């Protein structure tokens, strides 16, 4: 079967913006929880997110004009001309490629959603709603921006809507359709913009931590919303070879679960389900793994949930696993995208990043979840887990090429 | 059937609840009619753009569901479940199709329930506070809820997608479970798209539209397909699919990217336009639904495009376009032996610039 490669990563995200900025804010332990200026956080109490600070559209959008998208179609885009400007890919070289590009999402432009309905209830009146932005809000464009932006036509754009598992669910079906022979190219990853619309889901939740994400912390209180975007260039082992060029890590492997519990729980049984998948299909064992990226957000139920499955599947010594999001935050549609970007790179620079804010280790969670510093390894083959509401598990091995 | 590739996805069962009625037979006789689905919209919708909708007639959720976790379900979700339904059991509701563990679901959406999403953010505005929600919608606010809820529903613990796209949506879905399946990740599917009417939905088409455009004639529904490989096929196949192909409309000429897109379509079949029986274009009333069909105007027999009712004729159903019309192919094709061995296209182009068709090879 055809080996599939990771040639370029793009990277929009609260500790750092580009494949440089990004491995260190890994390596550092960068948080990247900041006060919320997207939106107004009156009333709730609280107002701290993983925003990404200083965004730039200028540096890497240059030909879809920036109202056709909105922050999340952005992230998406920058990240995307990073990813083929990383993996050494023109225009040029992507015109005349058949791709696929799939990026994930949760909640899309849920706050150009939002300024939409601000303009109705100002004007007590639909017709006030701006056009320019109902034009946007529908998830499927931030696929098919990439397209525009990249001048590539000859492309299947497709935005997956798994929530947290979707740049997980991108990369897998990038690795399928490239496996599948039908195309040489995949453009996947995943993209989300901070909104009122996930603040207040997961502040009503009572999933917001009242200061930092503690994932696996005896004491955690959960999460912090997060946005930005990862893409990542795959591209079969033939093609990655033939063109020269530099593979940061190979895709050894996914699988798909579904719970078909519980709307929002996560379930234990069906991430273990969704390890073991990815594990047959990467061809490799429990044994192997050098570490697990862990979906690993910070509430109770995910952390105990999920230790618990990673505990099924390895026995009662699983590798070390880290929880990413202990410094994005929870990028929703990013998360697993930037999961999969942090362990390629993880893989590529013979580190393991840290889950922060680690004060006690839950005792219902016997993990080494390699606290608050990163540490060197021989990180040869590494899991990044993803879950997501509706039951939706997604878990990504990559390798070392 | 015996004429088919290795691993070739089959069509062995669909589903529809539609503005033709709840159910395949509805949807199947509302297609071979012609029916016109547009009424008036219920009161209850509040002020809409346009009057005239075309809804689900004597839908109802909790009727059709039962009062168990029904009462905040979003019609997006309960369009999906009573669909599945109808692909999964038959009218007596014994199981017609045997799902497990390796039974994949993918469902295509545009932005799944805007109802949900702008009642949540109404309520956030509005109320005491901006996290005083109707708490109990906020599961079934995820886009990916209805696959979700499908596999619930159903015991389906395989692959678990939702893929956006809007009208495009039901052929991505289509294609990746094409993809998954050729990869062993699944040995049948549950495919389909899904778009619910709702006064936000409406509201926001009507503010997208073209600047002095009439308000869209807006349709709603689900429509699934029970998708096997030929091999494995545990019932009768109905249709082959035999290629898939999209293409991103980037220089604005929607009918170049249609034409590009189904000649490559036909090319990857190994079928020649000519022998096009039925061609299903989305009807979009847009631009690039007129170029569309101009495009395959051009493209197919003049008979293949008369084969089948205009798509029209249940307004703009958005994300479920694409599976209303290859369930037009099926139920134009079931009951009709001369529909056998027969080739058929389908074509969707949507707002945000995707262009998608399928070529399908007519069995039974």
């Not at chain 1, 899991?383 to 997604?394: E, H, I, P, V």
């Not at chain 2, 709702?198 to 029970?226: I, N, Q, R, V």
């Not at chain 2, 019932?235 to 490559?264: F, K, M, N």
Request: hydrophobic share 45%; with cysteine; aromatic share 4%.
């Amino acid at each position: 079967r055809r080996r599939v490669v990771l040639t370029g990563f793009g990277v929009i995200s609260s500790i750092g913006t580009g494949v440089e900025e990004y491995t260190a804010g890994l390596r550092a332990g960068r948080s990247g929880a900041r006060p919320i200026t997207r939106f107004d956080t009156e009333g709730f109490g609280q107002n701290t997110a993983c925003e990404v600070p200083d965004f730039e559209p200028g540096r890497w959008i240059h030909h879809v004009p920036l109202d056709d998208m909105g922050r999340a179609g952005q992230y998406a885009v920058a990240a995307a001309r990073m990813a083929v400007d990383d993996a050494g890919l023109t225009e040029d070289d992507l015109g005349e490629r058949q791709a696929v590009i799939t990026v994930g999402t949760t909640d899309g432009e849920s706050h150009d959603i939002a300024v939409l309905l601000e303009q109705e209830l100002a004007a007590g009146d639909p017709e006030a709603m701006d056009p320019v932005l109902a034009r946007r809000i529908n998830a499927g464009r931030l696929s098919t921006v990439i397209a525009r932006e990249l001048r590539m036509p000859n492309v299947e754009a497709t935005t997956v809507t798994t929530a947290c598992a979707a740049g997980n669910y991108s990369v897998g079906y990038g690795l399928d359709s490239i496996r599948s022979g039908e195309v040489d190219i995949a453009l996947c990853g995943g993209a989300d913009a901070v909104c009122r619309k996930a603040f207040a889901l997961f502040k009503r939740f009572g999933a917001l931590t009242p200061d930092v994400v503690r994932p696996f912390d005896k004491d955690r209180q959960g999460i912090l919303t997060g946005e930005g975007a990862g893409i990542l260039v795959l591209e079969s082992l033939e093609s990655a070879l033939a063109r020269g060029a530099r593979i940061h890590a190979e895709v050894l492997g996914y699988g798909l679960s579904c719970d078909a519990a519980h709307p929002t729980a996560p379930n234990r049984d069906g991430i273990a389900r969704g390890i073991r998948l990815a594990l047959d299909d990467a061809g490799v064992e429990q044994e192997e793994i050098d570490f697990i990226s862990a979906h690993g957000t910070g509430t109770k139920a995910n952390d105990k949930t999920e230790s618990a499955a990673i505990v099924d599947v390895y026995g009662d010594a699983p590798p070390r696993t880290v929880a990413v999001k202990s410094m994005l935050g929870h990028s929703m549609g990013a998360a697993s995208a930037l999961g999969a970007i942090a362990c390629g790179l993880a893989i590529e620079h013979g580190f393991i990043p840290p889950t922060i804010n680690h004060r006690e280790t839950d005792p219902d969670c016997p993990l080494d979840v390699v606290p608050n510093r990163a540490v060197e390894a021989d990180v040869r083959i590494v899991q990044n887990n993803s879950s997501a509401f509706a039951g939706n598990n997604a878990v990504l091995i990559l390798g070392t090429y | 059937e015996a004429t088919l590739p290795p691993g070739t996805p089959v069509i062995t069962g669909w589903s529809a609840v539609s503005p033709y009625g709840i159910g395949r037979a509805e949807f199947a006789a509302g297609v071979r009619a012609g029916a016109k689905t547009a009424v008036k919209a219920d009161a209850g919708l509040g002020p809409l753009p346009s009057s005239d909708v075309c809804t689900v007639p004597g839908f109802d959720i909790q009727e059709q569901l039962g009062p168990r976790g029904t009462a905040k379900m979003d019609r997006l979700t309960a369009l999906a479940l009573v669909a599945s339904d109808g692909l999964l059991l038959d009218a007596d509701g014994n199981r017609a199709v045997a799902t497990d563990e390796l039974t994949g679901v993918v469902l295509g959406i545009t932005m799944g329930s805007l109802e949900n999403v702008t009642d949540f953010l109404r309520q956030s505005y509005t109320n005491a506070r901006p996290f005083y929600v109707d708490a109990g919608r906020i599961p079934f606010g995820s886009l990916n809820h209805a696959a979700g809820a499908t596999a619930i529903r159903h015991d389906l613990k395989g692959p678990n997608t939702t893929v956006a796209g809007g009208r495009v949506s039901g052929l991505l879905a289509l294609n990746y479970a094409r993809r998954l399946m050729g990869q062993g990740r699944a040995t049948k599917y549950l495919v389909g798209s899904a778009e619910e009417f709702s006064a936000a939905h409406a509201w926001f088409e009507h503010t997208a539209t073209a600047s002095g455009d009439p308000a869209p004639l807006l349709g709603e529904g689900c429509g699934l397909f029970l998708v096997e490989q030929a091999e494995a096929a545990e019932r009768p196949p109905l249709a082959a699919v035999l290629s898939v192909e999209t293409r991103v409309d980037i220089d604005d000429d929607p009918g170049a990217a249609v034409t590009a897109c189904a000649r490559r379509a036909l090319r990857r079949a190994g079928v020649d336009a000519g022998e096009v029986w039925a061609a299903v274009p989305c009807a979009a009333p847009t631009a690039a639904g007129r170029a569309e069909h101009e495009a395959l105007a051009a493209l197919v027999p003049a008979d293949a495009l008369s084969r089948v009712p205009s798509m029209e004729l249940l307004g703009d159903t958005g994300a479920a376009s694409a599976s209303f019309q290859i369930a037009a192919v099926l139920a134009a094709a079931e009951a009709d032996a001369d529909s056998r061995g027969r080739i058929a296209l389908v074509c969707a182009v949507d707002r945000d610039g995707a262009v998608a068709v399928a070529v399908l090879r007519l069995i039974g």
